[PDB]
């Protein structure tokens, strides 16, 4: 998932099971004060949900990951 | 013993009739104020072949008298009709092959078909391919007409009962032998599940009252009584005569 943060503007999160791609696009707007191009979603085989949200071309993914604190 | 295979038929469940490909219930149109006083005109749009019937159908269309609409009925088409012919329906209608007339209005000696027993059951008497009824006299007192039937039996019915005029199309269907079990199979593929009929004497004592024995015979007299019960009624049911008639 670090390859998706560094190459593309793709932030990867583990989201709660009841979220539906509008509650994730709006969460990253409200939590991180950014804009989101597009959210993708899969349900991991350990039964949790993983969301490939994607920042849009002027927000950078490395700066948001460093302000969060997982580098 | 088991229940025998003429007892297994009343439950249906494989023995019901195969009704995917049939057009609909072939019935005369209902008795209304147009059809008791005067006639009503309709046109044969097409002549179709329904599956599991030896006679073609006719899809006449009658305009709705009370609404602005078309109402399509299905008649059992009789010989000589064609698409685009006009079918006139009622008391004051003409007398040609295809019109439907109450049996008082037709003269004695005519032949009609698809007659109704009661005056409003929408036609259920002579319907198979080639069978008519022959009017053999009216009765202006008591309002009755007497007809004979395809079985040779004479029956007196109401005089307001309708019936289309002419012998039912399909004609001499049974003059041709099927020649193959593969042609009788497809005939019963669209009728119901009763075709390969195992003889009763081939069976065991459980399966049939005929069955069993170190030879193949019936054992007791094959003419069964009338007040016999469900499961004994195998063989001729109440045979007055039996055997070939003359020789």
């Amino acid at each position: 998932a670090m390859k998706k943060v560094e190459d593309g503007n793709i932030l990867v999160f583990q989201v709660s099971m009841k979220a539906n791609k509008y509650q994730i696009k709006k969460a990253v707007k409200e939590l991180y004060e950014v804009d989101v191009l597009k959210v993708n979603t899969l349900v991991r085989p350990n039964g949790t949900k993983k969301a490939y949200v994607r920042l849009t071309a002027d927000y950078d993914a490395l700066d948001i990951a460093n302000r969060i604190g997982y580098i | 013993g088991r229940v025998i295979r003429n007892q297994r038929k009343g439950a249906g469940s494989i023995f019901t009739s195969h009704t995917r490909l049939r057009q609909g219930a072939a019935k005369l149109r209902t008795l209304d104020y147009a059809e008791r006083h005067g006639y009503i005109r309709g046109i044969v749009k097409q002549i179709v072949h329904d599956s599991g019937r030896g006679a073609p159908l006719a899809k006449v269309v009658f305009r709705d008298p009370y609404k602005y609409r078309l109402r399509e009925e299905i008649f059992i088409a009789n010989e000589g009709v064609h698409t685009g012919q006009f079918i006139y329906a009622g008391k004051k209608a003409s007398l040609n092959v295809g019109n439907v007339l109450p049996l008082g209005s037709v003269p004695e000696g005519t032949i009609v078909s698809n007659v109704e027993e009661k005056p409003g059951d929408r036609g259920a008497l002579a319907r198979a391919s080639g069978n008519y009824v022959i009017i053999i006299g009216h009765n202006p007192d008591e309002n009755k007409t007497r007809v004979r039937l395809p079985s040779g039996a004479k029956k007196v019915i109401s005089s307001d009962a309708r019936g289309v005029i002419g012998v039912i199309a399909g004609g001499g269907r049974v003059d041709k032998p099927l020649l193959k079990a593969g042609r009788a199979f497809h005939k019963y593929r669209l009728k119901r599940n009763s075709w390969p009929k195992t003889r009763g004497v081939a069976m065991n004592p459980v399966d049939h009252p005929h069955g069993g024995g170190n030879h193949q015979h019936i054992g007791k007299a094959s003419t069964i009584s009338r007040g016999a019960v469900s499961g004994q009624k195998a063989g001729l049911i109440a045979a007055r005569r039996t055997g070939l008639l003359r020789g």
């Binding site: 349900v43 085989p45 350990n46 039964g47 | -």
Partner: protein, 50 residues
């Protein structure tokens, strides 16, 4: 199957999390009668009927 329903994917994800040995710090408690994970399934031996 591949095209599977959610209430069997919810069941095979629980079986993934239960496909774990005993944690090794369990064997060090005071009255610890447990010695291995006896309800441990493997796809070769025992099919789960879900």
């Amino acid at each position: 199957a591949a095209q599977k329903s959610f209430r069997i994917k919810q069941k095979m994800a629980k079986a993934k999390k239960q496909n774990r040995p005993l944690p090794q710090w369990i064997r060090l408690r005071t009255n610890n009668t447990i010695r291995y994970n006896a309800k441990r399934r493997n796809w070769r031996r025992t099919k789960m009927n879900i």
